Amino acid sequence: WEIDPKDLTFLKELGTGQFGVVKYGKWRGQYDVAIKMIKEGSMSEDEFIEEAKVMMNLSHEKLVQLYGVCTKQRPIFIITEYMANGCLLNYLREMRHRFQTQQLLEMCKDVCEAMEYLESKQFLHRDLAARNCLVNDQGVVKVSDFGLSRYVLDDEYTSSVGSKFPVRWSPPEVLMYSKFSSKSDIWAFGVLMWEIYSLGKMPYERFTNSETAEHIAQGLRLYRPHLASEKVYTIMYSCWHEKADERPTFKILLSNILDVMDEN
Numbered sequence: 479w480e481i482d483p484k485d486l487t488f489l490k491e492l493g494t495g496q497f498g499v500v501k502y503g504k505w506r507g508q509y510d511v512a513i514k515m516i517k518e519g520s521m522s523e524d525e526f527i528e529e530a531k532v533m534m535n536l537s538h539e540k541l542v543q544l545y546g547v548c549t550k551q552r553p554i555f556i557i558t559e560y561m562a563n564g565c566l567l568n569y570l571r572e573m574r575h576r577f578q579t580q581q582l583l584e585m586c587k588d589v590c591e592a593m594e595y596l597e598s599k600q601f602l603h604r605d606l607a608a609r610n611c612l613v614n615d616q617g618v619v620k621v622s623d624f625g626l627s628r629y630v631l632d633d634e635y636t637s638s639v640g641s642k643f644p645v646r647w648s649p650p651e652v653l654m655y656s657k658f659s660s661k662s663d664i665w666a667f668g669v670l671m672w673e674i675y676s677l678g679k680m681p682y683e684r685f686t687n688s689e690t691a692e693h694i695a696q697g698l699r700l701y702r703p704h705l706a707s708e709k710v711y712t713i714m715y716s717c718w719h720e721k722a723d724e725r726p727t728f729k730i731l732l733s734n735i736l737d738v739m740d741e742n
């Protein structure tokens with residue numbers, strides 16, 4: 479899906495990410511979109527365009543929808559489904575005192591549904607976290623920026639000892655051997671559940687990344703947030719098995735989440 483940049487209208491600056499400036503605009507004067515303007519040197523562009531077809535085939539309600547790309551010009555554009563309430567982490571922090579427990583679980587469910595679908599397509603996110611989930615005007619959470627980490631050119635982000643690497647969302651096998659799998663996405667999802675139920679707190683606060691790597695290797699895990707039931711915590715904790723093959727699938731996690739709902 480190559481978009482014609484003439485069909486795009488820029489309206490507002492939405493901020494900055496790993497690829498640079500992100501803008502809000504419209505496609506053909508009607509559809510609200512987000513447009514990532516890829517800073518030169520920030521992306522492995524050839525490698526991205528080479529593997530763009532598969533991202534185009536990924537479609538799910540709880541996945542942020544890709545509209546298309548603009549590659550006949552520089553900077554490259556990536557155009558996506560706009561989400562009015564922005565990223566989940568700040569949404570949690572900003573609406574912290576308004577959340578009911580049922581809502582926190584529905585958020586987990588939204589995300590898990592998306593990841594189950596990705597799991598089914600053998601597609602990895604690689605940087606799952608609240609900051610890379612977005613929220614729309616009706617409070618629906620959707621998974622964002624799935625797979626883009628592979629294309630980042632920044633040693634501080636690509637290196638496990640880098641300052642931007644998602645250490646706090648990474649299992650031991652990633653920090654040690656850089657072995658990404660479904661089960662690394664699983665681990666990350668548990669940390670995400672923790673972000674949700676803690677209402678936007680930073681994992682392992684006052685720990686450095688290295689200290690965090692040290693302690694999870696030694697078996698330390700994130701404490702149960704006040705608003706998390708024991709049933710809920712058991713779900714997120716199951717994502718943090720030292721051994722990846724003892725970790726559940728997203729299909730199972732979703733069943734767990736549904737069972738907790740049903741009981742309530």
Ligand SMILES: CN1CCn2nc(Nc3cc(-c4cccc(NC(=O)c5cc6ccccc6s5)c4CCO)n[nH]c3=O)cc2C1
Pocket residue numbers: 492493494495496497498500512514558559560561562563564565605610612622623626627630
């Ligand atoms: C008043 N509020 C201001 C902030 N805000 N943001 C909104 N909604 C969106 C933000 C982004 C956005 C903004 C800044 C940075 C990033 N993130 C990135 O640019 C990147 C994230 C990652 C993750 C891994 C690897 C590479 C990248 S690039 C995004 C998500 C773009 O997909 N994208 N799409 C939206 O709908 C809505 C609001 C209303």
